[PDB]
């Protein structure tokens, strides 16, 4: 009476292993838990969403409103939690987009389902739910696209794609971002129309420069990779044009060392006499067959010994720094060099082509140019990128990845496959999907209507955010869908959608108008993810964790 | 009497320590109670360093988590030994000894000795087998029916995972399988099944392959992606640094000869790459339209993959030492250990073969086989523990399907085989039976522990036990007379009975074989101790 | 008994020769026992009178823990 059993014959596992069961609300607690993590990244979510300050173990600060980004940081706790944490991540690595859709999605089914287990629906009943509303989700998704990128580069379709991509993660200026990202674009693009050959594109080509100081419209867009470097011997201008020839080397430039006891041996005072001279003439001819195909730059990979950099300065040869391997990999691109590990005479199909190397002062120290022009395209364009703050400059570098990222989505698929934005795509399904449940006889039609309640968290999220009530704005959008179609088509009552501020009242006309477009490709994969990051947790009757 | 021997010990026994096998069990079994049939819970393992394992099989909990109490020490090592030979009955042998030791335990009350109690295991153990005999139904491998070993397959998948994951890889498992089945009918489960952990796209868009595939890829950009045909050489031999014997090393007397000697390194590399190049003189014929590939079980040297690149010859290195010995069977060639001596009778064909690069890592694939002797099975997966999920449910899939191919004979599942034993085992003369007095009880507490599994799968449904089985008793009485012979299963969708032949559920000869020999033994022994102490210096 | 090269297997493929892992010691003096074969450390000094013979059957079966290898004894 005074004390308990304290759980007879719990021996049987170490007293950190502690067992949780769907059982005693656990599940209930485990949905719980998901609402402490899902708003935070509802304030986050849209063009007016806030982003989010994280303080690692080690002082780094990343301020950022991508939920794919602020979770890595993050140190998770609860099991389930960490699939919701890991479903984000695989949305950001693969289509590069929807994150933030992955993480509000995946947390509204199950707080929908909380509905569902307290009316006594069984975990099983409740996936066949998702499952099957799922594969009527992604049918209809394919009727409701309209309009297409058709050619590969334009000026103005270019702003139609990765203008509302970007709108979301550092809104700012429309126009001043979204001419830096679409010229980047249309110099790694290998055009060749009419030839019939495979488009390609690399999402790691375009590379984003962080510089501090300045402004965000003193920004520009280089052809050529940009690095912090300091010449050895001499800068050069090199106003004499008529282009250059450049050999990049990815091994160092010295003697060729024995791998093994590399050591000098002098058996009489006559080799001694030789062997200071012998040194200098290894090198001298050597570089003069280099110096004798018109190179005038030459890239190494390691440490370059003092005695190799003096006959480089003698024909006013540049000398270039590619420590680690990606550094020096995507400079080839460029000029289109093949590297050859030996030091003598490169072949001259093998050189490279830059017009200009200049050096000048831009965030304070010497920067290097490689640059390129109209003529001789090159390709791996790099952006310079000037701000105030060092925070904002990795937000950015990952705004424009979620750029490049969509240009990845114009390659595999047969075509961009715009969708209609600011909410109208989850809007839509909800008519439809409420009509699809009640075409379902039996008990499962419970989890499919609920499913579509799930859709409705996008337009009260963007209501939300915009200083807006979501009872006034959100029921007078219904007034749209729920007309549904006249006795004439042509209807164009598909594009309205959720405004932020403004006027308010629902508003923006037709988003036609507005550009701003979703992608296909993206909300195929966006819902995939969420619906078994959900499913996942709901699957699991029991959790065990250890050490606490 | 031990606090005289030692002066700090632990000790229980006689009531004391026939407590211990029977509690220390019931926890166990009841861990793994939910666990067993296909509606069963789904259990997450989180250890304190991050990792997620997140399965349905029991050796999982049993590996992953520790466990103080002894007596589930020697339960542990049997349910993990019995998914090592079988590939399945971890959670069957929990619930057969852990229910056993409850069921003999009433008795123990009574007055009972533990030996005759155990004594009649053994007998009721021996009629199991000689009812197995008659129980079996005998299978011809001369037809290849397809539609059986879908059925068979489906048997570890629907526990494991769901209707979704089961159609994918229903026909993933059956393609792996049918390349098994050969003329030598020599089954190799290891070399012709592998599991590859890639995360891509959905689980659920897993496919099947023809052919091997590698974790390695190019290095060199100009090495051709896609060959057409393309003429695999095995090579065992590494060129690169090598150990250099304690490092003797160069002397030169002149600057000349320092990078005279430099030129030293490239000798020995190069005159193995001359043979190579005598060997594609050979097949040079209609160079454009196929190909020449090279793959090596250790690292190349970066020196020299530049010689392949302008020959257009891929490279692989730093392979795995089990996938060399399955470049035979796959292209098939032969291994070529020495350069010396070449010919083009080891040179292996491929129909296709080209790279798909996913984020840093590059991957190699290889298919379009004349007549491919091995296969494998691409396991693709959303989260780490997804890889996991899917492994343990595919390769506790492989062990079932192979061992019905080894003999001519299996074994109906949906409980059939645990309810005919109980009206055998109770309906049987004693007389006939070696045991008897006492030893009488003791077969009784081993025919109705069996009836314990077919309860449990109901336990799960939600449907109660006691019902669903008044039905079952009650079909078998009117089939003996009937002139009808037809195995009754349990439905735990509709909450009644069924055909195990007719729905396709199927179980593994020697997983029940093993299992019922397994669990009489841990619970025999269980009961014949008496008494648990520690000792020990430590 | 010791470790083996993956260059010296081949000129025995090559032959006929079987090439196996590294063997303890005390396995050493049972496989001698059988074949009747004497150990011989100097592979010059080996000879055809210490080559093990009357050996009934060569086979290897598979279980998933380990591989297994059998030498039968003609008897």
Known sequence: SLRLPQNPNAGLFKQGYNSYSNADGQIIKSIAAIRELHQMCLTSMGPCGRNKIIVNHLGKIIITNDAATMLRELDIVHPAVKVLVMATEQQKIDMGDGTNLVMILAGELLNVSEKLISMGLSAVEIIQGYNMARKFTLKELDEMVVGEITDKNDKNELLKMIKPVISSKKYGSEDILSELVSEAVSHVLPVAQQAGEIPYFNVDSIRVVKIMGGSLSNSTVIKGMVFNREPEGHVKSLSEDKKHKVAVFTCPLDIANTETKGTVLLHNAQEMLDFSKGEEKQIDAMMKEIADMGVECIVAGAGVGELALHYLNRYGILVLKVPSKFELRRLCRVCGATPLPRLGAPTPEELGLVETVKTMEIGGDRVTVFKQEQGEISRTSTIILRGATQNNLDDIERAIDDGVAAVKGLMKPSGGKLLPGAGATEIELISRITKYGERTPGLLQLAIKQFAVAFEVVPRTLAETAGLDVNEVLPNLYAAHNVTEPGAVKTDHLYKGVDIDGESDEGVKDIREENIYDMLATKKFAINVATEAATTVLSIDQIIMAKK | ?538 | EKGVSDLAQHYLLKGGCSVLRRVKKSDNNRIARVTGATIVNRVEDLKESDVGTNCGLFKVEMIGDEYFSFLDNCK
């Not at chain 2, 008795?107 to 021996?126: C, L, M, N, Y």
């Not at chain 2, 997804?386 to 492994?391: D, E, F, G, H």
């Not at chain 2, 599994?453 to 109660?464: R, W």
């Open chain 2, 1 to 538: 009497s031990l606090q005289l021997l030692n002066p700090k010990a632990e000790s229980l026994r006689r009531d004391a320590a026939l407590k211990v096998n029977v509690t220390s069990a019931e926890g166990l079994q009841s861990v793994l109670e939910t666990n067993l049939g296909p509606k069963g819970t789904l259990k997450m393992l989180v250890d304190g360093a991050g990792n997620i394992k997140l399965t349905k099989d029991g050796k999982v909990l049993l590996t992953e988590m520790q466990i103080q109490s002894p007596t589930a020490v020697l339960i542990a090592r049997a349910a993990a030994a019995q998914d090592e030979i079988t590939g399945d009955g971890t959670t069957t042998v929990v619930c057969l000894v852990g229910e056993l030791l409850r069921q003999a335990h009433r008795f123990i009350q009574e007055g009972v000795h533990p030996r005759i109690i155990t004594d009649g295991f053994e007998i009721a153990r021996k009629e199991s087998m000689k009812f197995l005999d008659e129980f079996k139904i005998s299978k011809t491998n001369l037809s290849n029916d397809r539609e059986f070993l879908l059925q068979v397959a489906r048997s570890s998948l629907l526990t494991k995972v769901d209707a979704d994951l089961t159609e994918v890889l229903t026909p993933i498992v059956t393609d792996a399988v049918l390349s098994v089945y050969d003329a030598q009918a020599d089954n190799l489960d290891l070399h012709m099944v592998e599991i590859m952990q890639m995360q891509h796209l959905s689980p659920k868009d897993t496919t099947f392959i023809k052919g091997l595939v590698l974790d390695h890829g190019g290095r060199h950009p100009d090495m051709p992606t896609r060959v057409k045909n393309a003429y695999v050489l095995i090579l065992n031999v590494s060129l690169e640094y090598e150990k250099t014997e304690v490092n003797s090393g160069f002397f030169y007397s002149s600057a000349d000869q320092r990078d005279k000697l430099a030129a030293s390194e490239r000798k020995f590399v190069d005159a193995k790459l001359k043979k190579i190049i005598d060997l594609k003189n050979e097949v040079c014929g209609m160079d454009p339209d196929k190909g020449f590939v090279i793959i090596n079980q250790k690292g190349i040297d970066p020196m020299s993959l530049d010689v392949f690149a302008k020959h257009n010859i891929l490279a692989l290195r730093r392979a795995k030492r089990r996938n060399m010995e399955r470049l035979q069977l796959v292209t098939g060639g032969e291994a070529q250990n020495s350069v010396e001596d070449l010919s083009p009778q080891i040179l292996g064909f491929s129909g296709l073969v080209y790279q798909e690069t996913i984020g840093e890592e590059k991957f190699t694939y290889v298919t379009e086989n004349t007549d491919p002797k091995s296969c494998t099975i691409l396991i693709k997966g959303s989260t780490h523990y997804a890889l996991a999920q899917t492994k343990d449910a595919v390769r506790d899939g492989l062990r079932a399907v192979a061992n019905v191919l080894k003999d001519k004979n299996i074994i109906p599942g949906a409980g059939a085989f645990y309810i005919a034993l109980s009206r055998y085992l109770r309906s049987a003369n004693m007389n006939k039976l070696g045991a008897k007095g006492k030893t009488k009880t003791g077969i009784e507490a081993f025919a109705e522990a069996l009836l314990v599994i077919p309860k449990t799968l109901v336990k799960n449904s939600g449907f109660d036990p006691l019902d669903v089985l008044a039905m079952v008793e009650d079909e078998l009485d009117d089939a003996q007379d009937s002139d009808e012979t037809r195995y009754v299963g349990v439905d735990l969708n509709i909450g009644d009975s069924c055909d195990p032949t007719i729905e396709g559920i199927w179980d593994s000869y020697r997983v029940l074989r093993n299992a019922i020999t397994g669990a009489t033994g841990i619970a025999s022994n269980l009961l014949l101790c008496d008494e648990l102490l520690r000792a020990g210096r430590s």
